[PDB]
């Protein structure tokens, strides 16, 4: 079932508007599969780095997008979010973060 589920997840992510963000949990509830948040996370993790899907708009519930060691992907996500007007700050732990309620997408 995952093959079709992944495409449903990507369709949902493609709907997050420019400058807004969402989370695995929100998307799962949005596509009518409230208990599949981890599956959503899996779908997102299996995406090709050059995909057209705007994966950078999906962040964890805590509003963070990295851990001090910022991977290439995390750097890409930060770069892309900032380009869409998202204000990103750095925590005392070295993680990049943003005010979730301020950018959270509302279907």
What technique solved it?
X-ray
Domains of the chain: 1-107 (1.10.10.10)
CA–CA gap between residue 72 and residue 36 (Å, rounded):
27
CA–CA gap between residue 86 and residue 27 (Å, rounded):
20
Residue 29 in 3-state DSSP?
helix
Crossing angle of the two packed helices 2-13 and 37-45, in degrees rounded to 10: 80
CA–CA gap between residue 20 and residue 103 (Å, rounded):
5
Is the separation of the CB atoms in 78 and 65 below 8 Å?
yes
Q: In Å, what resolution does this model reach? A: 2.0
Tokens of 18: 């420019």
Direct distance between the N- and C-terminal alpha carbons of the chain, in angstroms, rounded to an integer: 25
């Amino acid at each position: 079932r995952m093959d079709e589920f992944y495409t449903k997840v990507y369709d949902a992510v493609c709907e997050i508007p420019y400058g807004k963000v969402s989370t695995y949990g929100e998307i799962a509830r949005y596509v009518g599969m409230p208990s599949y948040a981890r599956q959503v996370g899996q779908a997102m993790k299996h995406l090709h780095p050059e995909t057209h899907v705007p994966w950078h708009r999906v962040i964890n519930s805590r509003g963070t997008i990295s851990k001090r060691d910022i991977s290439a992907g995390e750097q890409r996500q930060k770069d892309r979010l900032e380009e869409e007007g998202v204000e990103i700050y750095q925590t005392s732990l070295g993680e990049y973060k943003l005010n979730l309620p301020e950018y959270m997408w509302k279907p």
